[PDB]
């Protein structure tokens, strides 16, 4: 889900939680430097999360998640948020290009 | 927002060349959205009857 | 006119910007070369200027006499430009001296210097200073220089360059601590 | 379509006489580049570099405006060019853009 | 009968109190023969001393109103009139109706002369422009110089001599000062092949322009037919039916040293064109000719495309 | 046969915008506490980058790293073009390594060109750099006085490993972070300028700074072989590569040796130029751009 901010980055690691109520029900700590982006291999901590969202997508006990990534990118680098369609109301200064 | 052509294109002309052609023509769509504040997790709706 | 030495100079090409601020920094470096140490056995001028062109040049000639300009143009006083540039070498002057040289020549024809004095002494409004300051006594000028890096006004302005009498005779008048001309001849061809 | 471009040129000529005050004002952002063909009067507030905002001789985005008008005139479909007059619509649009570039080659100048 | 040595434009020939009807079957813009006679009279009072020669005219017709009114919302119009002075009996005059319009035009011409051969350029152009505003053109006086004088001095734009690409850019250096109008050219070949193409019902000749100032439609057995422009009849020459005469044979001529022929009107059609859609500006001149073997005293635009 | 219509590349060598502060010479050891060059309006109002008298030097924090994978296009339209551009750039690198490009980018790091007006007239410059893949440093660095160069370039028995680590990062064998700073003891009363807005100088918050694309310029002065001459020096790599200082279209578009003119003949008709025209080719291949028709 980090489109360009993942690639080039040195080390990333992902904090996923399950929200039962206004609290934390179960933790998940991952690392995308030890799992791929091309192969989808069976793992040892996230198959329980797979069964969690399998029960969620069947309706049997809902699940509210908090997927949070911690991407080490470099002190003061250039992140990539998304880009809007721009209307032509701007002059030569005033955020006309991007 | 923009997306690709998810229309059921009518098979009097449903060809691969036009499907590849209709991608570099994007969908100029500005829509509206209604999110919560990210500091909150409830929705209040009040009216009078 | 009276020099017995010289030194060549020409900056190299680069990406950054044109020779306007480079000519202003050269005028400041010349005012720190002749002025920042004091000395009258030297020449100074921009004879590669275009008064009919509104530019400054792509070459420089800051040379002096024999004993004066034999030990002046090989130090870091004009440093910062010894990697993408080059200084001259020790050579003799010509048998006929080109007796001419350009120094700081310019004017002021605005309502902030003269009208500034006429409002800080006379103290009146713009009526008398408009009746005693017409539009046909001076305007903006185009000297043989460029915009200099002096932060009293933001955008660059007219430089300070103006020629004089072009002779061929010798000028046996020892110049001041600016390297300019006071009426005689200096080394400038 | 060339007659429609000529009618647009006639509209520009009709606008080229009823503009006593042509300069920057409230509602002139798109008309700062749109004022190329509709060249207003020479601005007194301009300096010696008056050929950039009040003397803009850059009628190259007028080709972009003609391209926008050609794209918004009739919706060119992805399969309406099987004959020699479907891409020929784009050839006629390019001929109209060439005529517009020749017409606005000296618009602000 | 040739393309000129040099063109000559007069950008706002603002005229006034013109003749509207100009023929018994129309009322709009006046006859082009009025303009050809205008430039023959200009040639008579200029080019016999300045040695030029004028053949064709160029109409552009910037703006054109008419003193017309709508009576009670009918599908017709009327004319505004002028008060005739008092009759000798002193009750009222025999009031007679004519249309009087107030139009705008700019005339470009065709020169076979020495405007830059033995005389200088803007001297000839300025003297002709200064001398043109002392004569009427369609029964109406030219509105003289005013705030419209400020673009009025002109060049004397050559055509026959120059570079080819600069022939193009000189004639469209003349087009840039000619935008909001609509030029008048004839459609002689369109008259011919549009009466001959549409001869599948009857061979009549005067029914051509009598069946074009209207919305022709053979509708659905709502689709308005493809109008090719602005189909409108014009007075396109003078057929002299009766033979020639003499100044002593038929008295009450104007001068008694020029012969008389009773004449009738002729109707072609003239489309209105923007100046951008032409071949060249030398291809739109209303010339003049007389064929006294025929009755045809007819003006024309040779090579309109 | 035609190439791809839409065609693009992500930029490598992605820098940071360099906020500025003043400081003390022989305080590289703990340069952590220094206040910035705070911008002031005062009367035309002007902009002076003023430096204190108890700290005459300069401090310019920005950083640099490498995406890697110059062979992969960002968004290439066709499919019979990607499969040959991949092998073209790959068997370029394995045919001839880009170690000469690694040298020349190390020469752009070697000289302090990224500060344009801020360079000229100092006491001495010492560009620093450090090797980073996580928060601790790997191998520290120092530069010299003679080895600066305003146009000149030379390799060293300490700088060569830096050159080939930039090479191996740009190869794809371990991407690392660099954090750049350059000394300048330029003076008290020197108005030495960063980049400026559309006279508004570019003010990253409560400081003054340079843009990252302009700081990319003076890290990409590579193109020596424009076919007129090379005695003025190489230029920053771009197609139709020209500058405002010269004000003339270097790489004039009427010979085969343009970028756009030899590249479609170097993918399709296989017109291979020399080594030091291909460093220009790959050098503005790693600036990206909207390419194709």
Curated annotation (Swiss-Prot), chain A:
Instruction: Report the family membership.
Output: Belongs to the CRISPR-associated Csy3 family.
Quaternary data: Part of the Csy ribonucleoprotein complex with a probable stoichiometry of Csy1(1),Csy2(1),Csy3(6),Cas6/Csy4(1)-crRNA(1). A Csy3(6),Cas6/Csy4(1)-crRNA(1) subcomplex is also formed.
The part of the entire sequence present here spans 147 to 244 of 342
Q: Which domain of life does this protein belong to?
A: Bacteria
Name by which UniProt lists this protein: CRISPR-associated protein Csy3
Q: What does this protein do?
A: CRISPR (clustered regularly interspaced short palindromic repeat) is an adaptive immune system that provides protection against mobile genetic elements (viruses, transposable elements and conjugative plasmids). CRISPR clusters contain sequences complementary to antecedent mobile elements and target invading nucleic acids. CRISPR clusters are transcribed and processed into CRISPR RNA (crRNA). Cas3 and Cascade participate in CRISPR interference, the third stage of CRISPR immunity (Potential). Involved in crRNA production or stability.
As a miscellaneous remark, the entry gives: In this bacteria, Y.pestis-subtype CRISPRs do not confer resistance to phage DMS3 or MP22, but instead are required for DMS3 infection-dependent inhibition of biofilm formation and possibly motility.
- Keywords from the named record: Antiviral defense
GO BP annotations of the record are:
defense response to virus
UniProtKB/Swiss-Prot annotation, chain C:
Tell me, according to the record, the phenotype of the null mutant.
Infection with phage DMS3 inhibits biofilm formation; disrupting this gene restores biofilm formation despite DMS3 infection. Normal biofilm formation in the absence of phage infection. Loss of production of crRNA in the presence or absence of phage. Disruption of the entire Y.pestis-subtype CRISPR region disrupts crRNA production but does not alter phage resistance (possibly OLNs PA14_33350 to PA14_33310, plus the flanking CRISPR loci), indicating this CRISPR is not involved in phage resistance.
Effect upon mutating residue 152 to A:
Cleaves pre-crRNA 350-fold slower
Q: Active site: which residues?
A: 31 (proton acceptor)
> Mutating residue 157 to A: effect?
Very little pre-crRNA cleavage, still binds crRNA
Gene Ontology terms for molecular function:
endonuclease activity; RNA binding
The outcome of changing residue 31 to D is: Cleaves pre-crRNA 910-fold slower
UniProt keyword Ion transport, yes or no: no
Establish whether keyword Acyltransferase is in the entry: no
Q: What does the UniProt entry list as the effect of changing residue 150 to A?
A: Cleaves pre-crRNA 8300-fold slower
The EC code for this enzyme is 3.1.-.-
Matching InterPro entries, A to Z? Answer: CRISPR-assoc_prot_Csy4, CRISPR-Cas6/Csy4_sf
**How are cofactors bound according to the entry's free-text note?**
Metal-ion independent.
What mutagenesis or variant effect is reported for residue 104 to A?
A: Loss of pre-crRNA cleavage, still binds crRNA
Question: Site annotated as Substrate binding: where?
Answer: 150
Superkingdom of origin: Bacteria
- The EC class name is hydrolase
Q: Which UniProt keywords apply?
A: Antiviral defense, Endonuclease, Hydrolase, Nuclease, RNA-binding
UniProt GO BP: defense response to virus; maintenance of CRISPR repeat elements
Further notes on this entry?
Answer: In this bacteria, Y.pestis-subtype CRISPRs do not confer resistance to phage DMS3 or MP22, but instead are required for DMS3-dependent inhibition of biofilm formation and possibly motility.
Q: What is this protein called?
A: CRISPR-associated endonuclease Cas6/Csy4
Which gene produces this protein? cas6f
From Swiss-Prot, chain D:
| Top-level taxon of origin | Bacteria
Q: What more is known?
A: In this bacteria, Y.pestis-subtype CRISPRs do not confer resistance to phage DMS3 or MP22, but instead are required for DMS3 infection-dependent inhibition of biofilm formation and possibly motility.
Summarize what gene deletion causes: Mutants lose phage DMS3 infection-dependent inhibition of biofilm formation while there is normal biofilm formation in the absence of phage infection. Decreased production of crRNA in the presence or absence of phage. Disruption of the entire Y.pestis-subtype CRISPR region disrupts crRNA production but does not alter phage resistance (possibly OLNs PA14_33350 to PA14_33310, and the flanking CRISPR loci), indicating this CRISPR is not involved in phage resistance.
Q: Which gene encodes it?
A: csy1
Q: What interactions and quaternary structure are annotated?
A: Interacts directly with Csy2; part of the Csy ribonucleoprotein complex with a probable stoichiometry of Csy1(1),Csy2(1),Csy3(6),Cas6/Csy4(1)-crRNA(1). A Csy3(6),Cas6/Csy4(1)-crRNA(1) subcomplex is also formed.
Family stated for the protein in its record: Belongs to the CRISPR-associated Csy1 family.
Question: Which organism does this sequence originate in?
Answer: Pseudomonas aeruginosa (strain UCBPP-PA14)
Q: List the protein's name.
A: CRISPR-associated protein Csy1
UniProtKB/Swiss-Prot annotation, chain E:
Pfam families according to UniProt: Cas_Csy2
Tell whether Oxidoreductase is among the UniProt keywords. no
* Superkingdom as given in the UniProt entry: Bacteria
**Which processes are annotated in GO (biological process)?**
defense response to virus
According to the record, what happens upon gene knockout? Mutants lose phage DMS3 infection-dependent inhibition of biofilm formation while there is normal biofilm formation in the absence of phage infection. Loss of production of crRNA in the presence or absence of phage. Disruption of the entire Y.pestis-subtype CRISPR region disrupts crRNA production but does not alter phage resistance (possibly OLNs PA14_33350 to PA14_33310, and the flanking CRISPR loci), indicating this CRISPR is not involved in phage resistance.
Per UniProt, which keywords does this protein have? Answer: Antiviral defense
Give the quaternary structure: Interacts directly with Csy1; part of the Csy ribonucleoprotein complex with a probable stoichiometry of Csy1(1),Csy2(1),Csy3(6),Cas6/Csy4(1)-crRNA(1). A Csy3(6),Cas6/Csy4(1)-crRNA(1) subcomplex is also formed.
Miscellaneous information on this protein: In this bacteria, Y.pestis-subtype CRISPRs do not confer resistance to phage DMS3 or MP22, but instead are required for DMS3 infection-dependent inhibition of biofilm formation and possibly motility.
What protein is this chain from? CRISPR-associated protein Csy2
Organism, by scientific name, is Pseudomonas aeruginosa (strain UCBPP-PA14)
